[PDB]
Design a protein around this ligand. Structure first.
Ligand SMILES: O=P(O)(O)O[C@H]1[C@H](OP(=O)(O)O)[C@H](OP(=O)(O)O)[C@H](OP(=O)(O)O)[C@@H](OP(=O)(O)O)[C@H]1OP(=O)(O)O
Ligand SMILES: Nc1ncnc2c1ncn2[C@@H]1O[C@H](COP(=O)(O)OP(=O)(O)NP(=O)(O)O)[C@@H](O)[C@H]1O
Ligand SMILES: Nc1ncnc2c1ncn2[C@@H]1O[C@H](COP(=O)(O)OP(=O)(O)OP(=O)(O)O)[C@@H](O)[C@H]1O
Ligand SMILES: [Mg+2]
Lengths: 822, 309, 331
């Protein structure tokens, strides 16, 4: 083979079976049985073939079109061989490395010129991509990095079928014990458009992780968890001091035994390790008759109750500064605090499950505990039930603070069932709030109907907010407050006649007021927010309630309004009063101290950082003066914005947060635009019209954030002299999609505002003001008019548009849609 | 928050001095907890026992050899061909796992140093090796055997004869075979089968546990080798050197770090059977080991064996 | 029961049924497949997918056939049985009986304390006695057998919420489909639950098309809504996602009733179908159910009214009190 390599590399064709066919089809038995006992021959054959193919650029120019006639069918063969060799799960390390290098080279060359576009439609290409996807997520780190780089090289111009798998792989790899893997997969995930990341498809990797955890849980207890291990885990979860110097994998290995089944590839994920550690800790706590090293059978309960109560108390007034839970030394401290908060709830749930199974039992779900433990938990069942009932409310509050509505929903359901005989109103409000956060209007309606059998019509209004109908929800909240208080406190809005056609206790009053404020902020109506604040102040001064107050930083709202309005001086002045690091003129400590573990606070901090970076860039523009510093700020912001995604992956959520994902994408886009001065298409946010067919279950807030960060670049284009990428088309596309979603949920005011800004309080006003995306804009205007209530005017305009389109040039879908709708 | 750990040993401590005396200084680092694991190793002059213990207890291949918890050999010392570790060492990791590093057996350097200092020193060194081997086989759970070149034909005889000189339904610690500084030829199916067969024929009456544990095939070391290819996969592991026109770029074996990590994971999960018919704690185990050492020192079988030669 | 090993190294179990036509069962599956296809449009804008689990059946002639064996699902009856064993264990601290034995033991004294005996005809049985026995049996069993099982099966609260929602949606979909097609004999052994996803699966279909209304003991329940089934849906019961899902399913079926009627008509005039004017009657009954004229001379009921009426009739204590002993209504 080595001697033949001399003629294989020659570039000069008959002469017996050609080298390509000799090493491609003639020598194929070496990959079946010889590769197991003699891998040297297989490696030599693959090496000589690679050396011969790399000289002619893998015969890429021969296709899509003498020597060319014979080589016209070589690229497909190369891709097919690479793919078939990659799906094998019994390859050698050296062979796999060589194949990965070959695949990376081919992938990089396959985007070199535009002409190779048809090559992406060949079946061999799909087979090759499948092999690349199946080669990652392996024990080897270098192999995974190479596969990720190759996949990211040709991320674009790839079918969604492989994109979904890429999304799942990136999501699972976001929580790895190695920093290189996380950093490499972050870029790949960021390169995928938002129209696919926010899809409602199922993730296979997450399912595999869940299955492994379930299999381990269903097994019988091993009783190998030593007291020191429990002490260290509890110390880290309660105080943050692990007292250990990759300490999870080592512990897991030390807890196993070879004398007496989790996959080996999953041992490198921190999510599986954390869940296993929590389950083992709870198992040990239950099997130890509650006599854990933390104290006696009552000391553990007292400690948990005290910590939970302190957190619950701080939740009501986020100005308590609980020790070891609100202060951090750097940016990693806050993330660790959030992780600990989630682990605490997980541990409590596991403990409750084990106790119930110990005193009652299950069927094939969990093995029965020993008799000595069963009798102990059977005689002292009343004490455990009473303790859980007493701390249930605090647990629900903590769950709401940690952004885990499932915990509070389950606890609220259990509490409601136990109260089969005014602590009921608070429980109902908490359950309704959690349901609203989980976007489940049906559950809210059911709760309202069930509670009506015991004067709580306001619950129905909350259901509307869960569906995304903010315009109607605000009006309903105002009416409810006016009826429960007796004082007029409404705010000017759109005509209720068409608005309704298109779609007491102090705690309840405060809850409704805060709900209306958040509802107004969701649609990005700063004027409405100011009017609402004035009305609330007037109502409070006219009732002397002394217990009503909106929980929202007005400085942040004013800053956002000033930034969106185009005024930067007032924006900078407002931002200067916010907490955290001063505005750009150390990098690790960007977040302020005494920060609450609430995800909303983190989102607010990230938004403030983005605003500061944007203002600094605008001031600097009117290339390393104010560029070497803003880049670091944006990089750190992006590093902090990935925390929520990792937390979501830690648990089997099967979904990704929308606000967090959007913030991360916006930060990446801002960093790219700052480092490139709007020179490449990568500086634009990936929110196209495709999302209109795969993100119909999301609210309008995503488009609001995207538009807020896109208008900035659109208006900033006037301060750039060099050639830039076209942004008007992207902005108009975003505006049209946002208008469609806003109109589909009854938000007539927001839809009208978006349509008006894209085209550049009464039903007749819209008629008098309205009577490559031209046809789409006209169709949307007609649809909005019809939804408002003017069917005749909308039909007339649609008919006129149809006649005008029939005489156009293309009019492919315009004429069809116009006549069909008519 | 009074559940702080005892202490984190930054370096090992000599448990047995060169004069073969028991040192009572490791009790302060032990607690009153049960279910403890102990590890021991028997090797030659330059096999690399200290390096293995360092890499498996509290060290990584990236760390410098000067910061190893176990004093390893130095290049400037290999010229004289002398030993580096004397007596027995002690060190406990953060996972409550006890490690023990011993001196080389039948080391010519020890004999040479003893010359310039009851019948002949050869018998003295022989009995010393037998005593250390018996103590390890008596108070250890798993014993790893390190080797440089295969087919020694002498280590097996020593291990077999060491089991008949122990002080006291008997306890037999597991024996793990490790091949250090393995070459590319050793990572071949034919060579692997030959090694397995040779070990099986050489340890027919070992009477110790050396099969069904630490399977290298189950560790995905050989992805294509089927489990039925080997008649009886014994507990054998390979460790290559630290990190060609016919085969350019072909290594022939996995990375050194990967194999080291795999061995560490397999050893950390070894079984911990009861040494005696009573539950022993860290302090209890230390006391038992001290008593066993005192008893084996002034024994009778060892004296008879030494007198016979 | 046999097994087939495919090329992908995946085992597939099958049940070889004999002494049965199996031709109508194949038609039922095709109908279910079309119904599932009708939910593909909405399934793209809602997390809990609208699906109707079903298997594949292939007749191997005229009296034999093969049926796909669904794995990963377990019958609900098993859970109940396990509970009994656990209770028995308690009796040992300080052989479980068959449902028929328990029912007879509880109905004996009740009938003897009023005047009748065990030799009287089943039709001449007082309603109060049956209601009292049913109430006693209901109060003697706990309704947390299914809720606690699904709760303990999950790993994290998010998984628990997802599984609960999926189970409620699947139960509502199957309830509406079964009521429209006229499924019967919905005993505990004929219902399976998937702890991994929460979906419900049905097995027997030989007592379909209102065939259960004419037996030794007629049944007046559109579907199964026992204590354990209703308790696993949540604290509200059947007033939450269950009712809305049922209304949506009925709306989709009513909108596209033309395709269902055409398929049924084609099924009626099929030589390879053993219906024993019976087929015409079945077709008319299904047509009336789909059109909303189930029980009314000329008044067409709405989707909400139909759902409410079916739900009330499926949970009425009077109907559940006069059912067969095998069809355990207390659990
Ligand atoms: O506003 P569009 O972009 O034209 O959306 C339309 C239409 O919207 P409208 O409800 O406002 O008419 C409907 O959307 P959904 O009801 O699914 O939310 C749906 O048509 P239906 O009203 O009949 O359901 C579907 O139209 P179609 O069914 O023809 O696919 C859809 O998209 P297209 O009109 O572009 O196809
Ligand atoms: N597709 C299937 N998947 C899994 N289990 C099945 C399947 N089909 C049938 N079974 C099981 O097979 C069992 C035997 O059914 P069986 O009760 O004999 O039906 P049948 O005989 O046709 N009706 P009957 O004569 O009244 O008993 C059922 O109770 C189910 O538990
Ligand atoms: N896998 C390896 N690759 C390269 N060098 C190695 C390897 N293993 C050991 N060595 C080297 O060989 C020598 C082994 O001496 P070391 O002190 O580690 O233990 P030892 O041979 O058991 O000696 P002693 O019994 O005298 O303490 C050192 O110089 C070490 O650096
Ligand atoms: Mg050494």
């Amino acid at each position: 083979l080595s001697a033949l390599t001399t003629i294989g590399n020659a570039k000069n064709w008959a002469l017996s079976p050609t080298v390509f066919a000799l090493l491609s089809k003639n020598l194929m038995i070496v990959h079946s049985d010889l590769a197991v006992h003699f891998p040297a021959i297989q490696y030599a054959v693959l090496y000589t073939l690679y050396s011969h193919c790399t000289r002619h650029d893998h015969f890429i120019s021969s296709s899509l079109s003498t020597v060319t006639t014979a080589t016209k069918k070589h690229f497909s063969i190369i891709l097919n061989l690479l793919g078939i060799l990659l799906k094998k799960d019994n390859l050698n390390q050296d062979t796999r490395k060589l194949l990965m290098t070959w695949a990376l080279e081919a992938a990089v060359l396959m985007r070199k010129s535009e002409t190779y576009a048809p090559l992406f439609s060949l079946p061999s290409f799909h087979k090759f991509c499948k092999g690349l996807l199946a080669n990652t997520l392996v024990e080897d780190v270098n192999i995974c990095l190479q596969a990720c780089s190759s996949l990211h090289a040709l991320s674009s111009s790839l079918p969604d079928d492989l994109l979904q798998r890429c999304v799942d792989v990136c999501r699972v790899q976001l929580v790895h014990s190695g920093t290189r893997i996380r950093q490499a997969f972050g870029k790949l995930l960021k390169s995928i458009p938002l129209d696919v990341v926010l899809s409602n498809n199922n993730h296979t990797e997450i399912q595999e992780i869940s299955l492994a955890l379930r299999s381990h849980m269903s097994k019988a207890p091993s009783n190998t968890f030593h007291p020191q291990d429990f002490s260290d885990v509890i110390s880290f979860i309660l105080y943050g001091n692990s007292h250990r110097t990759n300490w999870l994998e080592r512990l897991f290995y030390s807890c196993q035994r070879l004398d007496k089944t989790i996959p080996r590839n999953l041992l490198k994920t921190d999510a599986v390790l954390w869940q296993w550690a929590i389950w083992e800790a709870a198992q040990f706590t239950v099997l130890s008759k509650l006599r854990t090293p933390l104290g006696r059978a009552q000391d553990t309960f007292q400690t948990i109750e005290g910590i939970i109560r302190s957190l619950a108390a701080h939740t009501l007034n986020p100005d308590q500064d609980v020790s070891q839970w609100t202060t951090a030394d750097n940016d990693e401290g806050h993330g660790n605090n959030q992780l600990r908060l989630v682990l605490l709830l997980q541990y409590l749930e596991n403990l409750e499950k084990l106790m119930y199974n110990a005193y009652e039992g299950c069927a094939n779900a969990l093995t029965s505990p020993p008799k000595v433990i069963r009798t102990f938990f059977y005689t002292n069942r009343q004490t455990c039930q009473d303790w859980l009932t007493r701390i249930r409310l605090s647990i629900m509050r903590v769950g709401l603070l940690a952004g885990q509505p499932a915990v509070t929903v389950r606890h609220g359901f259990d509490l409601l069932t136990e109260m089969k005989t005014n602590e009921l109103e608070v429980t109902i409000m908490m359950v309704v709030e959690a349901l609203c956060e989980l976007h489940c209007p049906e559950a809210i309606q059911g709760i309202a109907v069930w509670s009506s059998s015991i004067n709580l019509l306001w619950i129905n209004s909350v259901a509307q907010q869960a569906e995304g109908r903010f315009e109607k929800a605000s009006v309903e909240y105002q009416e409810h407050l006016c009826a429960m208080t007796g004082v007029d406190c409404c705010i000017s809005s759109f005509d209720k006649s068409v608005l309704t056609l298109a779609n007491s206790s102090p705690e309840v009053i405060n809850y409704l007021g805060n709900k209306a404020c958040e509802c107004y902020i969701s649609i990005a109506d700063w004027a409405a927010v100011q009017e609402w604040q004035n009305s609330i102040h007037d109502l409070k001064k006219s009732t002397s309630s002394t217990s009503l107050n909106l929980k929202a930083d007005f400085n942040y709202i004013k800053s956002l309004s000033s930034f969106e309005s185009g005024k930067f001086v007032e924006c900078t002045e407002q931002l200067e009063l916010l907490p955290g690091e001063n505005i750009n003129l150390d990098m690790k400590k960007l977040l302020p101290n005494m920060l609450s573990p609430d995800p909303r606070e983190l989102q607010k901090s990230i938004e403030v950082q983005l605003l500061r970076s944007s203002v600094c860039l605008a001031t600097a523009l009117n290339w390393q003066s104010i560029t070497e510093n803003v880049v670091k700020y944006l990089k750190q912001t992006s590093r902090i914005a990935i925390g929520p995604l990792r937390l979501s992956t830690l648990t089997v959520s099967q979904s990704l947060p929308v606000l967090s994902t959007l913030q991360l994408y916006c930060s990446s886009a801002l960093e790219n635009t700052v480092s490139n001065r709007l020179s490449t298409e990568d500086c634009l946010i990936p929110l196209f019209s495709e999302a209109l067919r795969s993100c119909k279950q999301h609210d309008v807030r995503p488009w609001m954030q995207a538009l807020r960060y896109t208008m900035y670049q659109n208006q900033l284009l006037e301060k750039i002299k060099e050639q830039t990428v076209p942004i008007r088309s992207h902005l108009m596309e975003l505006g049209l999609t946002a208008a469609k979603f806003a109109r589909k949920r009854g938000n007539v005011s927001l839809a009208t505002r978006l349509l008006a800004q894209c085209s550049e309080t009464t039903a007749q006003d819209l008629v008098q003001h309205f009577k490559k995306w031209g046809p789409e804009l006209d169709i949307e205007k007609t649809k909005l008019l019809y939804t408002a209530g003017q069917s005749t005017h909308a039909m007339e305009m649609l008919s006129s548009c149809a006649i005008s389109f029939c005489k156009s040039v293309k009019a492919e879908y315009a004429v069809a849609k116009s006549i069909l709708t008519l | 928050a009074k559940l702080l750990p005892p202490e984190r040993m930054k370096h090992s401590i000599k448990l047995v001095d060169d004069q073969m005396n028991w040192c009572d200084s490791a009790i302060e680092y032990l607690l009153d907890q049960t279910d403890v694991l102990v590890v021991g190793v028997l090797g030659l002059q330059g096999t690399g026992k200290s390096m293995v213990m360092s890499l498996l207890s509290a060290n990584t291949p990236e760390e410098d050899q000067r910061t190893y918890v176990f004093r390893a050999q130095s290049a400037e010392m290999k010229e004289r061909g002398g030993n580096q570790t004397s007596g027995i060492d002690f060190f406990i990791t953060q996972e409550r796992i006890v490690f023990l590093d011993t001196q080389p057996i039948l080391s010519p350097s020890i004999l040479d140093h003893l010359i310039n200092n009851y019948n002949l020193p050869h018998t003295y060194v022989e009995m010393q090796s037998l005593q250390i081997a018996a103590f390890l086989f008596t108070v250890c759970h798993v014993v790893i055997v390190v080797q440089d070149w295969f087919t020694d034909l002498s280590l097996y005889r020593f291990l077999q004869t060491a089991e008949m000189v122990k002080p006291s339904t008997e306890y037999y610690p597991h024996l793990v075979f490790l091949q250090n500084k393995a070459r590319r030829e050793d990572f071949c199916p034919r060579k692997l089968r030959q090694m397995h067969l040779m070990i099986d024929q050489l340890m027919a009456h070992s009477h110790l546990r050396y099969k069904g544990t630490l399977s290298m095939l189950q560790c995905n070391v050989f992805p294509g080798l089927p489990p039925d290819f080997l008649d009886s996969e014994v507990n054998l592991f390979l460790v290559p050197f630290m990190d060609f026109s016919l085969l350019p770029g072909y290594r022939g074996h996995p990375s050194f770090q990967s194999l080291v990590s795999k061995l560490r994971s397999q050893v950390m999960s070894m079984a911990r059977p009861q040494l005696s018919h009573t539950i022993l704690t860290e302090k209890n185990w230390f006391h038992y080991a001290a008593r066993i050492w005192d008893g084996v020192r002034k024994s009778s079988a060892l004296a008879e064996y030494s007198r016979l030669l | 029961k046999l097994l087939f090993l495919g090329s992908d190294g995946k085992s597939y179990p099958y049940l070889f049924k004999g002494l049965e036509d199996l031709h109508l069962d194949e038609r039922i599956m095709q109908f279910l497949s079309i119904v599932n296809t009708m939910f593909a449009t909405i399934n793209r804008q809602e997390t809990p997918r609208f699906h109707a689990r079903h298997y594949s059946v292939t007749p191997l002639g005229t009296r034999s056939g093969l049926i796909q064996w669904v794995d990963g699902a377990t019958p609900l009856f098993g859970l109940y049985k396990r509970w009994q064993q656990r209770e028995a264990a308690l009796q040992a601290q300080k052989i479980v009986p068959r449902p028929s034995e328990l029912y007879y033991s509880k109905i004996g004294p009740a009938l003897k304390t009023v005047g009748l005996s065990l030799d009287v005809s089943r039709r001449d049985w007082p309603l109060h006695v049956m209601k009292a026995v049913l109430e006693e049996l209901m109060e003697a069993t706990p309704p947390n057998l299914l809720a606690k099982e699904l709760w303990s099966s999950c790993t994290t609260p998010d998984e628990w919420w997802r599984v609960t929602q999926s189970y409620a949606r699947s139960t509502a979909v199957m309830s509406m489909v079964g009521y429209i097609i006229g499924l019967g004999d919905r005993h505990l052994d004929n219902v399976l639950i998937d702890m991994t996803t929460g979906e419900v699966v049905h097995i027997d279909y030989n007592v379909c098309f209102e065939k259960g209304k004419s037996l030794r003991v007629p049944e007046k329940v559109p579907f199964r809504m026992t204590q354990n089934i209703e308790t696993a849906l949540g604290v509200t019961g059947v007033e939450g996602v269950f009712r809305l899902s049922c209304e949506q399913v009925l709306h989709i079926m009513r909108r596209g009733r033309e395709t269902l009627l055409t398929l049924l008509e084609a099924f009626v005039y099929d030589p390879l179908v053993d219906w024993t004017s019976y087929a015409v009657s079945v077709w008319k009954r299904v047509k009336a159910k789909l059109e909303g004229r189930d029980v009314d001379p000329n008044r067409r009921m709405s989707v909400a009214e139909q759902v409410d009426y079916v739900i009330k009739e499926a949970t009425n204590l009077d109907n559940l009190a006069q059912l067969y002993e095998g069809w355990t209504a207390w659990v």
